[model samples]
Target: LSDDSKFGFIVIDGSGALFGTLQGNTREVLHKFTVDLPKKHGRGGQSALRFARLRMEKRHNYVRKVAETAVQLFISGDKVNVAGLVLAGSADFKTELSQSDMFDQRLQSKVLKLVDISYGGENGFNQAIELSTEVL
Candidate 1:
C-alpha cells in the first residue's frame, strides 16, 4: 500500500455514516456507524412541541457525531491526515454538517466536494468516491 496521504470520503444521512479513504485507486473503509434520527423531514415549527424538539435534537446529535468523528478519523494529532474530504448524502445533512461551527477548522478547510446521492450510507459513500474523482 502507498504511504501517500489519503482522501476522505464520508457519507452521512439521518440513518448513518460511512467513513473511508482513497489513495490512488485503492479504497479502504474505517467505519460504518449508525445514528437515530427523525423519520420525517427536519423542520422548525413556529411553537415548540415535545416531539418537535426531540426531532430537531436528534438531527443535531447526528450532525455533531458526524463532525466529531470526521475530526477523529481525518486528523492526525494536530494536522489533517487526509489530503482532501468529500461529504455525500441523500438529504441535507451533508451540507448542514459541512457548515457547522463545531467542525474542526483544519478538517473543514479540507472539504473538496459535497455530493448529492440517491441513497444513504454505503451506497452514498461509493457514489461520493465516483463523483469526486475530479477533485478527490
Candidate 2:
C-alpha cells in the first residue's frame, strides 16, 4: 500500500442470515468513507491521476471479521447464491495504510479486490455514497 490508497471489506449476505455482530469499525468504513477511490500511484501534482493503483495490506483481524460478517449475513436471510465478496477502496496514501489499521471490520474480506473510481466536488461526500447499495 502507498500514501494515496484506500481499501475496504466486502461480505456477501447471500445465506439469508447476518454475517457477524456489529463490532468495531466495519460499518463505519462502508458507510462513512466519502470516496472509495482505487489504490493507484502518481507523480507529484497534476500527474497524480496517471499513476493511481489499487493496493491493500492483508490483516488477520480483517480477514476474520470479513469471514464472520459473511457468515452472519448468511444466517440473517441474505441468500445462498454467494456471488463472492468485494472489499474495495482508494486513497492518496496506500503504502501507509494497513487493513488491520482500517478499524472498519464491516469492510473486511478474505477474497476481495479494488475497482472503479469517481470524482466529486469539495470533500467528495457525494462520491462516497454513490456506490452504496444492498448485497442482495
Candidate 3:
C-alpha cells in the first residue's frame, strides 16, 4: 500500500496512551503504556496549592511522553511515515500536546482531527480508529 494512505492515530490522557499506524484494513500498534498521575482532589489552603502544582507538572510530563513517543513511532528520517494523524482524548491535554513546542510542527500539520473521546489507552485507541475511519 502507498504510504500516503497509511494513517496514524494517538489516543492519550493522564492515565495512559496508545499509538498506531494503519493502511487499508491492517493496523500496527506502535506503542502503548499505562501511566499514573495525581487526580483532582478536594482539599484546602497551601497544601492544595502544592497538590495543584504537582498535578500540573505530572500532566505536562505525560504530554511530553506522548509527544516524544509520537516522534519515535511516526517519524523516519525527514518524513513522517504516516499520511495523516488523528488525536483522540477526553480533554485539553490533546490540545496542549498539539500546540506544545515539543510536538513537531510537521506532525501538527498532518493532524487530521482532534476528535473527542471520554477515555484513552486501549479503549479509546480502537474507538479513535472507528471514529476517524470515515475520514481516513
Candidate 4:
C-alpha cells in the first residue's frame, strides 16, 4: 500500500489485526476472547486502545476509524464475531479517546450506533454486548 493509499496506515493503526493475521490461529483465539467478554468479562481494552492510539494520533483519523470500525462490526454481526472480540475488549475505549488531544473536536456530535451494553443498566443497554459463539 502506498503512503497515499487509504489502508496504508492500516498496518500501523491496526497493527493488532496485522499481527493477528500473521499469527492466524493466534489472532483467531484473541478475537474469540473478545467475543466472550460479555458473559466472562475477562478482557480489557489496553491492547486495542493502544493500537488505535498509535495509528489514530490525529483526532479526525482516530474517531473516523473508530466510528467506521464500530459500524462495520455491528453490520457484519456474526461475521464479525472474531474481530469484534477485539472491539468488545475495548470497553474503556472512549476514555482513552477522550484523552486524545482532538477528542472533543473530532468526536463531538459524532453518533455511533452501539450494539451491546449489558453492564450499563437499561437505558445504558445501548449496543454494547457480550458475545460467545459457544453459547449459541
- Computed on alpha carbons, the lDDT of every model, listed in order, comes to 0.69, 0.30, 0.70, 0.28
Top lDDT model: 3
Q: How do the candidates rank by lDDT, highest first?
A: 3, 1, 2, 4
> Which ranges of candidate 3 are over 4 A from the true structure?
1-4, 36-53
Candidate 4 off by > 4 Å: 1-14, 17-56, 76-92, 96-136
- What TM-score, computed on C-alpha atoms, does each candidate reach? 0.73, 0.24, 0.72, 0.22
Local lDDT at 39 for model 3: 56
Q: Which has the better lDDT: candidate 1, or candidate 2?
A: 1
Best by TM-score: 1
1-136 in candidate 4: lDDT tens per residue? 1122110001112222210111122111112111111111224554643544444344345444544544353335433322222222135444444433543332223322222223332222212212222211
What TM-score number comes out for model 2?
Answer: 0.24
lDDT of 2: 0.30
Model 2, 20-102: lDDT tens per residue? 11112223232221222333335445355443322223233334444454345433454332233333223421121224444
Question: Residue 13 of model 4: what lDDT?
Answer: 22
Clashing pairs in 4: 38-130, 114-127, 115-127, 116-127, 116-128, 116-129, 117-128
* Residue 119 C-alpha lDDT in model 3: 67
Backbone steric clashes in candidate 2, count: 53
